[PDB]
Design a protein around this ligand. Structure first.
Ligand SMILES: Nc1ncnc2c1ncn2[C@@H]1O[C@H](COP(=O)(O)OP(=O)(O)OC[C@H]2O[C@@H](O)[C@H](O)[C@@H]2O)[C@@H](O)[C@H]1O
Ligand code: NA
Length: 174
């Protein structure tokens, strides 16, 4: 039974959020697509990318190395679909801007646009961790950009509560 999401809070007609770890969710939900928050060389570091890769026993990194050897690096805001291995049917690797290095935060719109090629996705908040974007800003861009069904896994309970509170204020406009 694929895409068996449960316990999400509905934010908009197509964006849902849950205080959960993205790997544990993938194991529970068996999603068609899980989203990786990637860099342009698909060298999977210490955030979601490392978590997903470790859960595939490094199969994600070997596949990514093979992709890069054939195709070269991605562009910021770009994506590629590879295997989801034991976690999902497919993994959508998306490159958000690295705001810590001064890349353009507006490319987060381009990054989330990639979600619109998939009916339903399990995803993290792009650029909001190692890449240093404000998590509330990443959620705002997600809500304004994605039209397909996005289930957001936010593992930190304090961040989750902060995101919901900030989302409500922006939506009500006070
Ligand atoms: N296991 C997890 N489950 C859910 N959310 C998570 C998890 N780990 C981190 N997060 C949260 O998801 C958001 C995404 O953070 P990152 O994974 O660091 O993604 P990003 O900010 O885009 O940085 C990308 C960079 O990090 C490396 O892992 C990756 O190879 C790339 O270079 C952050 O809010 C982070 O706290
Ligand atoms: Na929750």
């Amino acid at each position: 039974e694929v895409n068996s999401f449960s316990g999400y809070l509905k934010l908009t007609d197509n964006v849902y959020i849950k205080n959960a770890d993205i790997v544990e969710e993938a194991k529970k939900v068996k999603p068609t697509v899980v989203v990786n928050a990637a860099n342009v060389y698909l060298k999977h570091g210490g955030g979601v990318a490392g978590a997903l890769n470790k859960a595939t026993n490094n199969a994600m990194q070997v596949e990514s190395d093979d992709y890069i050897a054939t195709n070269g690096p991605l562009k910021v805001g770009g994506s590629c679909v590879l295997s989801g291995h034991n976690l999902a049917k497919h993994c959508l690797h998306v490159v958000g801007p690295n705001v810590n290095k001064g890349e353009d935060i507006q490319l987060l719109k381009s990054a989330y646009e990639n979600f619109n090629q998939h009916e339903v996705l399990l995803a993290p908040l792009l650029s909001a961790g190692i890449f240093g974007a404000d998590p509330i800003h990443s959620l705002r861009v997600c809500v304004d950009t994605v039209r397909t069904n996005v289930y957001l896994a936010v593992f930190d309970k304090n961040l989750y509560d902060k995101l919901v509170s900030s989302f409500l204020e922006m939506k009500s406009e006070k």
